[PDB]
Amino acid sequence: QKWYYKDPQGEIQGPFNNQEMAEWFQAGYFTMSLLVKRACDESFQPLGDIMKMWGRVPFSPGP
Amino acid sequence: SRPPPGLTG
Hints:
Chain A: Belongs to the GIGYF family. Chain A: It comes from Homo sapiens. The complex is a heterodimer of chains A (63) and B (9). By secondary structure, chain A is α+β, with helices and mostly antiparallel strands. Chain A contains 2 helices and 4 strands; from the N terminus they run E-E-H-E-E-H. Chain A has a single domain, classed as Dna Ligase, domain 1, CATH 3.30.1490. Chain A has helices spanning 18-27, 47-54; strands at 3-6, 12-16, 35-38, 45-46. Chain A starts with a strand and ends in a 9-residue tail after the last helix. Chain B has no helices and no strands.
């Protein structure tokens, strides 16, 4: 549940929780090229690749 | 609400 992303300079920001990531995503700060991962993930992935592979990003909330 | 560290909006 520990999210990281790379900023435009390549610096790794985080960890952030699901709610913080979801808020920033809904506010529009993230393009689908933003590179994200949790500590437990294999590699950074752009949000768009996560969407193409899973149909959703894990931090998106819902029922 | 703060912006994401390393991003500005």
